[PDB]
Design an enzyme around this catalytic site. Structure first.
Site, mmCIF file in Angstrom:
data_model
loop_
_atom_site.group_PDB
_atom_site.id
_atom_site.type_symbol
_atom_site.label_atom_id
_atom_site.label_comp_id
_atom_site.label_asym_id
_atom_site.label_seq_id
_atom_site.Cartn_x
_atom_site.Cartn_y
_atom_site.Cartn_z
ATOM 1 N N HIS A 16 0.804 -1.222 0.000
ATOM 2 C CA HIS A 16 0.000 0.000 0.000
ATOM 3 C C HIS A 16 0.824 1.253 0.000
ATOM 4 C CE1 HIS A 16 -3.838 -1.794 -0.069
ATOM 5 N NE2 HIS A 16 -3.420 -2.711 0.806
ATOM 6 N N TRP A 86 -7.325 1.342 5.084
ATOM 7 C CA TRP A 86 -7.312 0.067 4.405
ATOM 8 C C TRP A 86 -7.532 -1.090 5.379
ATOM 9 C CZ3 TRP A 86 -7.328 -1.879 -0.375
ATOM 10 C CH2 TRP A 86 -7.208 -0.975 -1.422
ATOM 11 N N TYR A 128 -5.374 -1.062 -19.653
ATOM 12 C CA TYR A 128 -5.700 -0.590 -18.324
ATOM 13 C C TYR A 128 -4.426 -0.325 -17.527
ATOM 14 C CZ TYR A 128 -7.613 0.259 -13.821
ATOM 15 O OH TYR A 128 -7.896 0.867 -12.613
ATOM 16 N N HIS A 165 -7.909 -9.991 -5.939
ATOM 17 C CA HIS A 165 -7.818 -8.715 -5.250
ATOM 18 C C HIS A 165 -8.022 -8.824 -3.749
ATOM 19 C CE1 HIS A 165 -8.250 -5.894 -8.903
ATOM 20 N NE2 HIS A 165 -6.990 -6.108 -8.589
ATOM 21 N N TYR A 180 0.212 -8.438 -10.100
ATOM 22 C CA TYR A 180 0.555 -7.351 -11.006
ATOM 23 C C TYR A 180 2.010 -7.476 -11.460
ATOM 24 C CZ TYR A 180 -3.774 -4.927 -9.865
ATOM 25 O OH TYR A 180 -5.107 -4.541 -9.761
#
Ligand SMILES: O=C1N2C=C(c3ccc(O)cc3)N=C(Cc3ccccc3)C2=N[C@@]1(Cc1ccc(O)cc1)OO
Ligand SMILES: [Co+2]
Ligand SMILES: [Co+2]
Ligand SMILES: [K+]
Length: 185
Positions: A16, A86, A128, A165, A180
């Site tokens: 994060h 988060w 994207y 996710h 990713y």
């Protein structure tokens, strides 16, 4: 999916922190919902040629998602508070997951996938990755597709990306590492 959270793991913090710094384009240590929604609507949806309806739906989902981690218009949030947000979002999302209530990350995914129409091709994901900037290397987008369980055409479905996710953003599931590629640790 690994459901137990791991919020004190340095790797989850770093994941994060990487994303925060990526959103903190001017390097002043703070971000706002305004900036996130402008990225979503004025940049990403415009470049993806989303319809007005699709853009609006996507915006509502982005607003809900980031409000779930404490963001708000005009509210300048630095990384520690963002990360605390988060932890809250992850906790709430996992409760929704357990009770078979759609998650905010699923609903955001629905909105993204609809712009690309519940499947995305590798080329769409590569676009994207560049447009959102989360994964501008096409090799890292290829890694996403290698990593995920794909459908029979080799396309990615929103159910699978949602599960990934959960593990990648919320629980630091080893099974989600590499989602990713090298674009996001
Ligand atoms: O998951 C995703 N993201 C997570 C974060 C993000 C930001 C901060 C964090 O601390 C952690 C994660 N930032 C962005 C990129 C973005 C940010 C802001 C506004 C628009 C887009 C982003 N794009 C998504 C969109 C998506 C969602 C569900 C799907 O099924 C498929 C694709 O796929 O990568
Ligand atoms: Co389906
Ligand atoms: Co299969
Ligand atoms: K695969």
């Amino acid at each position: 999916v690994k459901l137990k959270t791991d919020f004190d793991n340095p790797r989850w913090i770093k994941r994060h922190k990487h994303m925060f710094d990526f959103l903190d384009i001017n390097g002043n240590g703070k971000i706002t919902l305004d900036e996130i929604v402008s990225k979503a609507s004025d940049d990403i949806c415009a470049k993806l040629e989303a319809t007005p309806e699709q853009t609006k739906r996507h915006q509502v989902c982005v607003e809900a998602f980031f409000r779930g981690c404490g963001m708000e218009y005009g509210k300048e949030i630095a990384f520690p508070q963002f990360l605390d947000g988060w932890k809250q979002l992850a906790t709430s999302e996992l409760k929704k997951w357990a009770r078979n209530e759609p998650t905010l990350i699923r609903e955001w995914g629905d909105a993204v996938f609809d712009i690309f129409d519940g499947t995305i091709t590798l080329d769409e994901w590569k676009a994207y990755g560049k447009i959102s900037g989360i994964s501008p290397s096409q090799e890292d987008c290829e890694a996403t597709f290698r990593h995920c369980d794909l459908d029979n055409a080799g396309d990615l479905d929103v159910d699978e990306m949602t599960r990934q996710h959960l593990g990648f953003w919320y629980t630091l599931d080893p099974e989600a590492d590499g989602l990713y590629g090298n674009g996001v640790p």
